Amino acid sequence: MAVDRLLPSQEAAELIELTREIADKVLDPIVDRHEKDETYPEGVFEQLGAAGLLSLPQPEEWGGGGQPYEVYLQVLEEIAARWASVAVAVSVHSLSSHPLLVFGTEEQKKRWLPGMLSGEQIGAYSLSEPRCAATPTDGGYVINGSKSWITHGGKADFYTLFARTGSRGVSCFLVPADQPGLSFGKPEEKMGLHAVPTTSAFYDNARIDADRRIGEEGQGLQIAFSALDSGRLGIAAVATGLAQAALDEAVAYANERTAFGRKIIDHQGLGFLLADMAAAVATARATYLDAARRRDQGRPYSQQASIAKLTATDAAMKVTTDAVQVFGGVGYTRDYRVERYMREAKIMQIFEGTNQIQRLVIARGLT
Amino acid sequence: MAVDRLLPSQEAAELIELTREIADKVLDPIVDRHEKDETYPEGVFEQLGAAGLLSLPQPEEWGGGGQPYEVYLQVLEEIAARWASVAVAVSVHSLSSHPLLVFGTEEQKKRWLPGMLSGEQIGAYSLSEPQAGSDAAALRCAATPTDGGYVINGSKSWITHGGKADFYTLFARTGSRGVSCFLVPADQPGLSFGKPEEKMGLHAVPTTSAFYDNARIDADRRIGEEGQGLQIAFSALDSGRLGIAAVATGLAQAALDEAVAYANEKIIDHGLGFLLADMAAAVATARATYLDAARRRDQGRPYSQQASIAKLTATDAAMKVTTDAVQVFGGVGYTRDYRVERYMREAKIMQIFEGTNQIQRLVIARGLT
Amino acid sequence: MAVDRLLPSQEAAELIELTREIADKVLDPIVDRHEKDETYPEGVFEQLGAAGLLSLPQPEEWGGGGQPYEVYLQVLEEIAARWASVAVAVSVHSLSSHPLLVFGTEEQKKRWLPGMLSGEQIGAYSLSEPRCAATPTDGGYVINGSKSWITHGGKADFYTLFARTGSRGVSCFLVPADQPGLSFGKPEEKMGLHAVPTTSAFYDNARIDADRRIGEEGQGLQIAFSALDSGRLGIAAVATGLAQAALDEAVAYANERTAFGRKIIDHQGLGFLLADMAAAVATARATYLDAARRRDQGRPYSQQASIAKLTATDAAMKVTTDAVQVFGGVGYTRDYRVERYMREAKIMQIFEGTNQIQRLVIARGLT
Amino acid sequence: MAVDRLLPSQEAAELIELTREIADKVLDPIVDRHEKDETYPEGVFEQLGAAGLLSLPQPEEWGGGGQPYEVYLQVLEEIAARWASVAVAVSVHSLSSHPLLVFGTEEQKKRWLPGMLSGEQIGAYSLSEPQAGSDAAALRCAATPTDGGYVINGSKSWITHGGKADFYTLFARTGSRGVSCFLVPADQPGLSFGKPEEKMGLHAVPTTSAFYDNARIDADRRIGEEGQGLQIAFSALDSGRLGIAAVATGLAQAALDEAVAYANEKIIDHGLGFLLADMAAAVATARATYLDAARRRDQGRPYSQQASIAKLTATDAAMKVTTDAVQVFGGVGYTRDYRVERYMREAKIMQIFEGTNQIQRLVIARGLT
Numbered sequence A, C: 001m002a003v004d005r006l007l008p009s010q011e012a013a014e015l016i017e018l019t020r021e022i023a024d025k026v027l028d029p030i031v032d033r034h035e036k037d038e039t040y041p042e043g044v045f046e047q048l049g050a051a052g053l054l055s056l057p058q059p060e061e062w063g064g065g066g067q068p069y070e071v072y073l074q075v076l077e078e079i080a081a082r083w084a085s086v087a088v089a090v091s092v093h094s095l096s097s098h099p100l101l102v103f104g105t106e107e108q109k110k111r112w113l114p115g116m117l118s119g120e121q122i123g124a125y126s127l128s129e130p131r132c133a134a135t136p137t138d139g140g141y142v143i144n145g146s147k148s149w150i151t152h153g154g155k156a157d158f159y160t161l162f163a164r165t166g167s168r169g170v171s172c173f174l175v176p177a178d179q180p181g182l183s184f185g186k187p188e189e190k191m192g193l194h195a196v197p198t199t200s201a202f203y204d205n206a207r208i209d210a211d212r213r214i215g216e217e218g219q220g221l222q223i224a225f226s227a228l229d230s231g232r233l234g235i236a237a238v239a240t241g242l243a244q245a246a247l248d249e250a251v252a253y254a255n256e257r258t259a260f261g262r263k264i265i266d267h268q269g270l271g272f273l274l275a276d277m278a279a280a281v282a283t284a285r286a287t288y289l290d291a292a293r294r295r296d297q298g299r300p301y302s303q304q305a306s307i308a309k310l311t312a313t314d315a316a317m318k319v320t321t322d323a324v325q326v327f328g329g330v331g332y333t334r335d336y337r338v339e340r341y342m343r344e345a346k347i348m349q350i351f352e353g354t355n356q357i358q359r360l361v362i363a364r365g366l367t
Numbered sequence B, D: 001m002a003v004d005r006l007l008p009s010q011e012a013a014e015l016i017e018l019t020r021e022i023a024d025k026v027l028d029p030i031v032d033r034h035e036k037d038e039t040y041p042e043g044v045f046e047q048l049g050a051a052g053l054l055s056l057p058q059p060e061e062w063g064g065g066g067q068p069y070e071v072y073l074q075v076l077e078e079i080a081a082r083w084a085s086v087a088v089a090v091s092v093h094s095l096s097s098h099p100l101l102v103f104g105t106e107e108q109k110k111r112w113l114p115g116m117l118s119g120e121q122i123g124a125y126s127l128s129e130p131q132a133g134s135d136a137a138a139l140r141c142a143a144t145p146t147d148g149g150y151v152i153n154g155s156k157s158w159i160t161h162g163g164k165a166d167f168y169t170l171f172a173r174t175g176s177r178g179v180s181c182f183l184v185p186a187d188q189p190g191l192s193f194g195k196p197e198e199k200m201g202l203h204a205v206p207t208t209s210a211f212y213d214n215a216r217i218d219a220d221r222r223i224g225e226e227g228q229g230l231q232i233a234f235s236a237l238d239s240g241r242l243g244i245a246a247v248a249t250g251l252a253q254a255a256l257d258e259a260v261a262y263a264n265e266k267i268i269d270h271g272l273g274f275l276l277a278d279m280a281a282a283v284a285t286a287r288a289t290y291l292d293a294a295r296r297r298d299q300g301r302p303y304s305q306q307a308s309i310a311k312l313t314a315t316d317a318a319m320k321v322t323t324d325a326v327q328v329f330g331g332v333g334y335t336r337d338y339r340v341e342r343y344m345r346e347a348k349i350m351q352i353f354e355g356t357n358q359i360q361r362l363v364i365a366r367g368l369t
């Protein structure tokens, strides 16, 4: 009943089985309770970290696994099938370390990367706003202004920040949890995806060392643009895992429940609905792996990653809406998980670039 | 920012005007808090009933307002744009009086009908069981004949207004022509209600199960002949399916108004125009479809196919429009700072009750055979 | 098996039965042959004309029927179910007379309207181009330039023309068939809708009397804008009739053909496809009548007419594509009509304002 | 303006390069005229065969090119972007050699296989009858046993390359396990072909019926055991469904390139951007889906579900992309001055043959049971 996967090696299959074993004993027994109460899973990230699952695609020299995206994306997909909000946070952690790895000095990487990729820390990514500025000073910078929609806000070990210093008018910072002048608003009240908090930040004459600026002064916009494709790939794989979870529920229910003297899967009309869901899940998985396989070969994959995010998140919204339908009246109650999965899928159409903005990007790439 | 309506007279126009006033004064200011807390709205059904709004379509000789469906359904639409859960309950009340009005004895009508349509009472309708929602004929609640009556033993489920209605229209087994209809009072001995279902949305009016424990009932409470029940339940389908078509259209219209206002406060420019255009087409199309079926009914013509088409069309539109309305707001659309996330949760169950959209398609195909 | 219609009177029902009787003996026995050979139905318009069907909505004082749009649109729908290209031409004829009726002088109407609405003439409408100018002269105007996509081009008795004389820089003309300086290109080779020709026009120092200018000099753009809503309503009703014809074929075929030991309509999956088609036909008919009913009461109906054209033409493309599917392999051959109906529906999405341009119009009406 | 392909080696890249050259030189300059006139392309299959293009996937020990499906299918895609009717015929030729290659005797293979894969021959595949397309088991063409052979009496239909192939793979009735397979030569006595079907599109290679009139055949021509036929026909389904997925993707890609060029010559501005964006997503998604199934096959793993999904997905995409490509051109898109009106007519039959898209859905649902 588990997905039959296309994998490059024996060691990759054994990584998949390891993820499935940890997810089923650390994630599955606690997910419904924490999402209902909107409480934080303390200690869950440490256990994922110790099994090597928080630093899979980063180079081994810096303490990562050096796994390709074709393998890493599928592990992410397996996590999301058990707990979507935790999978989103695992993806955010990968992006949070990208500036230092790609643009940091040799001195900066020896100082901080081992710690970031040890499995004991968790990172957050901070660029969105509701005009946040860093002004020069002796030996560094002073920060003033506001930030919005930070995943893991208030709970992370470190924060990646973008702040104004025209074209080359932006700069990137590695900000520590203990930063003087830094505070966080209350967690947002959302329709779903409750466990990992989402918060805004406020900087009040916050002073920072020059040694925490990542890359050259003005290199900000280039740094942030360099991480778009990888983020969209992350969310494509998360949406695919939630679509798979909703499909597994419906398939199981349609093989037990009966009406008019037969199992409901045996009514041809209902069978066709289930068939469209399964085709949409398999098309979304095929599309993200095709982009992944380009990235692993050092080929351009920018158009392909926008297509993958678009395809996968539209698929999840359609499949979860249809899984409630398969259940009937009980599917509309909290005795089952399908109502929660439908609430989680809607926000995937919106973040990491809205789907309208994905269509715009694809268009500009044909003009 | 108010729907331009096609109405048969100046009188109907003022009745719409009366509805907008009551809904904006009584329903709109308390709806967010009651849906969030999951509590019952005391006093609300008493206020609508005194205005005439709970008995519009029924004949005046029995205390109704005599209105045609072309007017009744559009009043229902205006209500549902403020509070979907309340309008669903209004629709159920109409169905709950239907078996007595069409099938009862003149003596039975004289007893009970005037109190039902008075504006102070609330009706509920009870047909579904756990092993039988879509498939009606497989029901099993037992009503077995006694000296001058019946004894009822069994279970029912998914009762809208369960545990709060003044009367219940019941369907129980006496023997294919084995089913009968009953008017059950709220004080019936042996009758009890389980706890309210915990749902994804539509929280205010409760949905509950029922249990009959040696519930002896007078044989004068039976509506129609013994074994007539499935014919009674079948005759109400057309009317109920139009009710819900009107409710889904008003929920879609409410979500469309939120998104138009937001896109103007421009966010429209920064392909949102085309998304809003497709939303506006969906609402207009659903409204015209339910009205076409209504005029056929008002004229005394066949309207069964057209009523299935209206319900399917209007509920598929609410699910699509509410989902795209969250999309128009962006990230704040996904928070409880606005109403659109609630509207999306309310639309899903509409695709499911009053005959699922797969049953609707099966009805339509049969009408082509 | 004929459509059950909502009609205002006894006399309207009897108009419907008259249309059905004429269409079934004048149109149905000859449509497949003329469309296959791409030849013109000489004499068909005279017979429609003599039964009063070419001037149904124009006022009785000028020789029309004074019928409301709620009745006229449904007659048009009945014609289109038998021969779509002839129905489009009937609609074009209504528009061709609109300028003179609404903006013409009392002298101009006594001269020409009775003839136009007698049933012996046929009119065409000429505004599209691939910059056509009328320059002043003693006693009138001289015309130079080109026009495109004229339905009935080369075969009409009269032509409604728009030509340049900024804001108020356009003027409208009633041009006769015998106009010196006027010629027509060869008929366009289209995917379908062959019987009534579509042509371009060329004006070569073409001199015209001032008495043929309709309305004031500069009133052109206002005249042309005043006819948009009515045209869109015409095409909505034509698309609805072609969708109905494709649905009737498929329903008939699905009740005879058998597979796996049962009539194919009895396979629930196929039954659901037929059910979606029927719902789309009924939704399109409901939408155009709702706009019609506004126009009959002197209420605004501009947004509603754009919605109706959009809804109905998208419905026809979906229903005709699905009717071929119901037929299987035989549906892809010219032994049946469903392949022709699919070719006819595509051009309805395009003309009288493309569907993208309809979406734009609806958007501007919410801004 | 050329597809960026993922390929397993430099050798495969050059084979793609060879395909683009032959297709642009031989197919592209004559395609519009032959499809318009409805005539056969003499010399064309002879030229592709000498380049190795008619036997790519089969083993070298028998004269094929040994290519995996991940390469074969993408060559098929490049062809179909120039001439859809020709690429369909290439796909059929592969299926026509399949029963002999997997089920025959070593002695049977030695006789006939090398000539089939030589590049000079053309194969056809014959299964469907008028009373049996979707439902295979209901076939009725009779093959009755004689002294050292069989006698064939009956009718077959919808034969691609009917009346022009060098050999025919036939399925006829001998007795559920009542069906057998036959390799029929083009010079068989008692065999005749009806006139070409008049179709909406795909005109160049003819589709015809066949008639067997006391057609005596040698018992050494039977492929596999007596009563093995339905198992043989079943085993070819997975392969044929991928062939057509590749053909539909290349037809969609051709229609996408036309519309992108036109929108740039701006027409894009005057919501065409969003329509083109959805077209580009549909093509990319169909390509990735057929390739995922191909790599499973190349690895010797189960790929049945994934092959049904690929065919359904890729043909639904061709119908949607070709229909929107006419839309991008406007009025001139509806004329025979451009290719897009032809592409739209070609896409419709793809939803129908090699198992209709309703049968595909039925296969997928069963795999979930």
Ligand SMILES: Cc1cc2nc3c(=O)[nH]c(=O)nc-3n(C[C@H](O)[C@H](O)[C@H](O)COP(=O)(O)OP(=O)(O)OC[C@H]3O[C@@H](n4cnc5c(N)ncnc54)[C@H](O)[C@@H]3O)c2cc1C
Pocket (backbone or CB within 6 Å): A257, A258, A259, A260, A264, A267, A269, A270, A325, A326, A327, A328, A329, A330, A332, B092, B125, B126, B127, B128, B130, B131, B132, B133, B134, B135, B157, B158, B159, B160, B207, B349, B352, B353, B354, B355, B356, B357, B358, B359, B362
């Ligand atoms: C909030 C709420 C309020 C309600 N209020 C009332 C009420 O007041 N009175 C009342 O009588 N009922 C009420 N109901 C019950 C409601 O009408 C049923 O839940 C619904 O109609 C479907 O029945 P089910 O839940 O048993 O689904 P099932 O019948 O178990 O169906 C499950 C799935 O199988 C499919 N299916 C079933 N049969 C077929 C078929 N023949 N062909 C193809 N597919 C099929 C369905 O479409 C569905 O997707 C209420 C329900 C809810 C959720």
Ligand SMILES: Cc1cc2nc3c(=O)[nH]c(=O)nc-3n(C[C@H](O)[C@H](O)[C@H](O)COP(=O)(O)OP(=O)(O)OC[C@H]3O[C@@H](n4cnc5c(N)ncnc54)[C@H](O)[C@@H]3O)c2cc1C
Pocket (backbone or CB within 6 Å): C257, C258, C259, C260, C264, C267, C269, C270, C325, C326, C327, C328, C329, C330, C332, D092, D125, D126, D127, D128, D130, D131, D132, D133, D134, D135, D157, D158, D159, D160, D207, D349, D352, D353, D354, D355, D356, D357, D358, D359, D362
């Ligand atoms: C151009 C062309 C070339 C062809 N070439 C070949 C060839 O080379 N070799 C060959 O063997 N065949 C060939 N065919 C035949 C082709 O495979 C069939 O036409 C097709 O698969 C469908 O069968 P049918 O036409 O009898 O449709 P039918 O089986 O009559 O089906 C009609 C409709 O009913 C539906 N239906 C049928 N069964 C079910 C079911 N169980 N559940 C739900 N719905 C169902 C179908 O989806 C379809 O919509 C060719 C056909 C064409 C058009």
Ligand code: NA
Pocket (backbone or CB within 6 Å): A120
């Ligand atoms: Na430590």
Ligand code: NA
Pocket (backbone or CB within 6 Å): C120
């Ligand atoms: Na005359």
